[PDB]
Design a protein around this ligand. Structure first.
Ligand SMILES: CCCCCCCCCCCCCCCCCC(=O)OC[C@H](COP(=O)(O)O)OC(=O)CCCCCCCCCCCCCCCCC
Ligand SMILES: CCCCCCCCCCCCCCCCCC(=O)OC[C@H](COP(=O)(O)O)OC(=O)CCCCCCCCCCCCCCCCC
Ligand SMILES: CC(C)CCC[C@@H](C)[C@H]1CC[C@H]2[C@@H]3CC=C4C[C@@H](OC(=O)CCC(=O)O)CC[C@]4(C)[C@H]3CC[C@]12C
Ligand SMILES: CC(C)CCC[C@@H](C)[C@H]1CC[C@H]2[C@@H]3CC=C4C[C@@H](OC(=O)CCC(=O)O)CC[C@]4(C)[C@H]3CC[C@]12C
Ligand code: NA
Ligand code: NA
Ligand code: NA
Ligand code: NA
Lengths: 530, 530
């Protein structure tokens, strides 16, 4: 009878976990190679994340058993890949956010934000996108996400509670903060790390170049690209999760103004009934401002920060990172009392006073920390390390070489598509470092100017929108549990193509004059050209 | 008035955190050196752990801010020290223990253990010590602790609930399991990792030695040492936490037999009212047996395991570790259903069936995992790495050289005291690797036989009993929150001296005949001797 078909549909995750590793076994069986053994693991983890047949942190533990059991890397070497400085930065940022939420400062910030920008979905999403992109121009993307994801969560909670469809707004705001942190970092030379890697490669492979890639020329090239890509991402996320209406999205017309003025006066009254700030709110607000100001001035690149003055290494770089500052502020939050004269009496011995708790105690942290996101970030780093140790990146980099029998405006588009597809599985810095010296020689072989193929390769590494392991902002937005990986993939599949087309617009207009991409200059000559 | 003296005593942890870093500042100020900068951090973390002015995982985060801020190591290099394979082994073992506790198998195991060995404190502690030492002779110490600490916790909970002073029994059982895992590993050549390091050094520094250190001679030397040290540790932990009575400790005499027979019949009835095993209990019991059998036969050393047959490296060693097996079994626990035909109906849509949950879901794991012990183990590894990168181990190793103007039975005692003191701060393998080639040349300089100074150095690295970062068993016993670090230090300070005296007994009787430690053989000759 038909009662077996519901039993087969209820058990669908067990069937996925049993049948997906069997159906992909022809790839390691028919092609015995470490590149195929790593491609099997990448396809398996992507299929287990998009279907969510297992929890996210459980799928993130799969390199630890997969890579030693096919000879890619040792268990000792895959074990120290799961906790880097970018993961400690997330730990310290969320350690500050837990103290913000515990002492009701998140309600103050959310009510003041909703009092300033109002209650309209698309202008509020646009304001969050613009602020996240401007912050990501100057600090790290991970620091921007770890600062901005709980603020958007609190604003969204207060917006829900003032109106008593919201489950699409909670996806649109999370994905817009996630994508704005990645988009805004490409506009400056110090915004994302591969932007510096390109300058290191241009200085090493081509001396006598005369500092062709600096702060001013990179800004003049990559700021309109960032603005156009951010506005198109706003329009696409507004179309996909909200409607095609554009008057309901902007709150235009009556039967919409009435509910919006009612929600605005409800927000006004519940903000008025908060009172003065307590001692803990003032202390946490001062520490938050100090943390963001220390993140700004640590290593700016266009002037000399406190990380270069105090604590330099032999190369002059800072030995202290952003995660060090985050862990420092989070440790200080355990030491400052929550009330200063707060000497109470304990339920034990009746001759004792009692010191207050700190701004953080350990049991609040243990109840509130997303440890699955720590494990997800670590599993992403381990999969990215296994892709370099197996030889996938060297194999796919050497497939870009026979593209020489293609006209030059199409080489950049095909290369940008390939790099934007491959950067979902790997690291941005490693992909840039491996892929740039191949493209430099490929451009020297056909007498094409470098940075016609090196600038789209550097920009396409940042177009990482589909998988949780593509960028650390892609994993940080799963901290509250309302998102699915299928929503992120469905939103990012078109954003990759839109970003590739925006890079192709930027390299063929206003990138040709300010870089002289039609001349093949004399600093790119060698013994193989002529 | 006198009401200020209670306000000063209530605020004692804040005063410790403020005044201890200021009072130790003459050590980095008067002695500017990286060895002093690391000694400052070690003394500060030991003082913050023994007083517990901060939580344990918060004090374990101190290398991340300390080592880049005095130039010892970079933030990127100290960040990848916090999650090794021994930490993933604890994660996988406790991931199995959470599933044992969630499905009431821990009550079955605890009631059957209390039905077999009875209810008497000192014989039960001795049985746990003997089983933990015998298990630690053949598998890793971390695997033995991660298997045996929750079992002792469950037995202790059932023993408390059958008798309705226990707060001293819960310290004695935790510390006895912790110390038995460390003591039992010295008896075999494959029990602890420095035991193999010594054999590598004897083979590398002195060829033509004729395999003087093998399985049989190491067993014949180190098994009575282990037995004597285990019995003396049992007697000392019985004296320290229990009384000097030895008849109340063994339950001898009436007014003690009555309560013990009452507790035994209460245990009999509440074990009889459990019923047959469910599906989840049978599945978890089979997986537990399979996990311990895979831990036994992976890399035994005296025969060829499945880790050497399948998955070898170029040197023939196993690429798969014990943590890989633990993570493998813990991942399988998410896939097996808790009931097989358990198709229920969901509170949502009334046309759906519902698959059961697994033996593990993520929310039970998040509620039950001790993440502070993961951070504590990682902070210990980072402090141990900073001690090698700063140069403390090379500095303290070169202080063993001017001990040549001491008679030879006292050189071994002074060296064992120094190594047993220094191994509380550092790693056992690194201390052995650094300290053995200095002692070999020091013994060649005075025409003393090696292994008169290399065997006490190898054995004294395992006498690690005072600090949570000395051994991973020292950190695993804080998983349930009943212990203090001051109890561990108070119990281990005398056990270090007892172990040094037992090593001095073993090297001067029955170690002289079976190693010929009175002859200076011909394989230790060089160009500097004669
Ligand atoms: C160049 C200088 C740095 C510029 C940095 C980028 C620009 C940031 C502008 C953000 C403006 C957001 C609205 C107003 C400020 C935030 C709320 C606030 O001040 O709370 C006061 C609120 C108290 O207000 P009260 O109830 O009136 O006393 O809290 C505090 O005083 C302490 C807050 C410390 C941390 C502030 C974090 C603010 C994050 C805001 C994110 C906004 C995203 C969307 C913005 C759309 C703008 C178009
Ligand atoms: C050489 C072969 C391997 C030897 C390994 C080392 C020796 C281990 C002996 C441990 C004996 C402990 C008492 C009996 C076994 C535990 C309880 C049991 O059988 O549960 C059955 C109990 C069933 O109870 P029932 O159905 O109600 O009869 O559970 C199971 O069947 C599941 C078994 C899973 C694994 C259990 C591991 C228990 C470790 C206990 C450690 C005890 C420490 C103190 C022992 C002092 C001895 C002097
Ligand atoms: C951990 C739990 C959830 C089960 C996981 C099952 C699969 C996802 C994995 C785990 C072990 C894997 C196997 C481990 C080792 C091999 C040998 C490998 O062939 C070799 O010879 C590998 C070594 C080499 O030749 O270098 C082919 C893939 C295969 C069968 C792997 C196929 C995929 C398997 C079954
Ligand atoms: C963890 C947070 C909440 C509080 C930490 C306070 C102290 C435990 C630490 C943190 C910063 C440390 C300082 C960081 C750097 C230095 C410089 C150092 O002198 C140097 O010149 C170091 C660099 C070098 O010469 O190689 C002397 C120690 C001192 C003052 C350290 C003393 C101990 C301090 C105050
Ligand atoms: Na950035
Ligand atoms: Na990437
Ligand atoms: Na062992
Ligand atoms: Na140690």
């Amino acid at each position: 009878m038909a009662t077996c078909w519901q039993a087969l549909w209820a058990y669908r995750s067990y069937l996925i976990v049993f049948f997906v590793p069997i159906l992909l076994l022809p790839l390691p069986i028919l092609v015995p190679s470490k590149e195929a053994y790593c491609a099997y693991a990448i396809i398996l983890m992507a299929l287990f994340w998009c279907t969510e047949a297992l929890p996210l942190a459980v799928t993130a533990l799969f390199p630890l058993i997969l890579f030693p059991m096919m000879g890619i890397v040792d268990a000792s070497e895959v074990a120290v890949e799961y906790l880097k400085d970018s993961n400690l930065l997330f730990f310290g940022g969320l350690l500050v956010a837990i103290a913000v939420e515990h002492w009701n400062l998140h309600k103050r910030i959310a009510l003041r934000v909703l009092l300033i920008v109002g209650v309209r979905p698309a202008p509020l999403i646009l304001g969050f996108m613009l602020v996240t992109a401007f912050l990501s121009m100057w600090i790290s993307n991970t620091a921007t996400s770890a600062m901005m994801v709980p603020i958007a969560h609190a604003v969204l909670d207060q917006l829900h509670s003032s109106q008593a469809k919201h489950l699409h707004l909670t996806q649109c705001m999370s994905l817009c903060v996630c994508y704005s942190a990645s988009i805004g970092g490409i506009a400056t030379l110090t915004g994302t790390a591969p932007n510096l890697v390109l300058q290191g490669q241009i200085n090493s492979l081509f001396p006598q170049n005369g500092n062709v890639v600096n702060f001013a020329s990179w800004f003049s090239f990559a700021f309109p690209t960032m603005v156009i890509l951010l506005l198109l991402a706003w329009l696409w996320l507004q179309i996909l999760f909200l409607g095609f209406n554009f008057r309901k999205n902007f709150g235009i017309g009556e039967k919409m103004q009435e509910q919006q003025q009612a929600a605005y006066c409800v927000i006004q009254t519940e903000h008025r009934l908060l009172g003065p700030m307590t001692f803990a709110e003032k202390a946490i607000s001062i520490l938050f401002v100090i943390l963001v100001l220390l993140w700004f001035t640590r290593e700016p690149g266009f002037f000399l920060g406190w990380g270069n003055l105090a604590f330099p290494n032999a190369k002059g770089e800072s030995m202290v990172s952003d995660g060090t500052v985050a862990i420092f502020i989070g440790i200080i939050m355990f030491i400052i009392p929550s009330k200063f004269p707060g000497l109470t009496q304990d339920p034990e011995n009746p001759g004792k006073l009692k010191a207050p708790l700190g701004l953080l105690d350990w049991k609040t942290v243990n109840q509130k920390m997303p440890w699955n996101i720590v494990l997800l970030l670590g599993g992403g780093y381990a999969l990215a390390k296994g892709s370099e140790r197996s030889g996938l990146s060297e194999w796919l980099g050497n497939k870009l070489t026979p593209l020489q029998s293609v006209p030059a405006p199409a080489i950049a588009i095909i290369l940008s598509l390939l790099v934007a597809t491959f950067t979902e599985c790997t690291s941005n810095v490693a992909t840039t470092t491996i892929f740039l010296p191949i493209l430099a020689s490929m451009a020297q072989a056909i007498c094409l100017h470098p940075l016609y193929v090196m600038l789209p390769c550097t920009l396409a590494t940042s177009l990482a929108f589909m998988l949780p392991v593509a960028t650390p902002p892609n994993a940080i937005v799963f901290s509250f549990g309302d998102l699915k990986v299928l929503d992120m993939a469905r939103a990012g599949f078109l954003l990759n193509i839109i970003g590739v087309l925006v890079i192709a617009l930027a390299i063929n207009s206003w990138g040709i004059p300010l870089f002289s991409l039609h001349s093949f200059p004399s600093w790119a000559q060698s013994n193989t050209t002529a």
